[PDB]
Amino acid sequence: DPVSKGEAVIKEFMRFKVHMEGSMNGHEFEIEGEGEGRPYEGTQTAKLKVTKGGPLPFSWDILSPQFSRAFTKHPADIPDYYKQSFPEGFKWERVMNFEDGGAVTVTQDTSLEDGTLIYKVKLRGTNFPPDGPVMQKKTMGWEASTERLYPEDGVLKGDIKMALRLKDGGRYLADFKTTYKAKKPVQMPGAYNVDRKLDITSHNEDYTVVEQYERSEGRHST
Numbered sequence: 001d002p003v004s005k006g007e008a009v010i011k012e013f014m015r016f017k018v019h020m021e022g023s024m025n026g027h028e029f030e031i032e033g034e035g036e037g038r039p040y041e042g043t044q045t046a047k048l049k050v051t052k053g054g055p056l057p058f059s060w061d062i063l064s065p066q067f068s069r070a071f072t073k074h075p076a077d078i079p080d081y082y083k084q085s086f087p088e089g090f091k092w093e094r095v096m097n098f099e100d101g102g103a104v105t106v107t108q109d110t111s112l113e114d115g116t117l118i119y120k121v122k123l124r125g126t127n128f129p130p131d132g133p134v135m136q137k138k139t140m141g142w143e144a145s146t147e148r149l150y151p152e153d154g155v156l157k158g159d160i161k162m163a164l165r166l167k168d169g170g171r172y173l174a175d176f177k178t179t180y181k182a183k184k185p186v187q188m189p190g191a192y193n194v195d196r197k198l199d200i201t202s203h204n205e206d207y208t209v210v211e212q213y214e215r216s217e218g219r220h221s222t
Contacts, residue, residue, distance in 0.1 A: 002085075003084050017118055019119070023124055048067060066121050070083055072218050073218060079188070082182075085184065088182075091108060092107075096176050098174040108122075149192055154185060192221060196217075199214075
């Protein structure tokens with residue numbers, strides 16, 4: 001039932017709209033955007049615009065992984081927790097923990113209205129050193145990653161070792177922990193991994209208009 005319901009509502013081509021409200025070291029901001037992709041190929045794009053609190057006094061990179069779980073490719077034998085949750089959708093809650101003490105909490109709602117995916121994001125980041133690479137905008141995107149997911153009482157729990165490139169050639173590390181919760185019962189996968197590359201593909205001078213691309217592919221763990 002849930003797989004069949006999800007398969008019928010998530011098409012080979014899908015659009016989304018996103019709104020984010022957030023704060024970083026007490027600096028309030030808002031983002032609005034739109035995106036599109038191929039949910040079974042695991043590819044997507046989005047165009048985001050800063051609507052309040054711009055130009056952002058912090059790296060765009062903190063925000064980019066918060067803009068789309070319906071767009072992951074799976075092999076034949078791993079059921080899609082996220083696509084099955086439709087039309088009702090799912091929520092998620094994330095903590096990002098950085099090597100220098102920066103900490104972010106993110107909460108997200110995913111719904112479907114008139115055949116368009118709708119994303120609402122709330123973000124709170126604290127404890128970033130004001131002279132650190134995030135607040136100085138000295139990051140240059142996320143390295144490719146592997147999210148390790150496991151099922152737990154009807155939800156998925158994911159862990160990611162993440163790495164932000166530094167302008168000087170360094171790596172700035174973080175750990176992401178996320179809980180993903182469908183709004184109705186779905187057929188649960190076993191534990192599996194999601195390999196991702198997320199790229200900023202274009203931006204205006206002050207990063208108040210930004211385009212991103214993400215490729216995401218599920219696989220078994222060996």
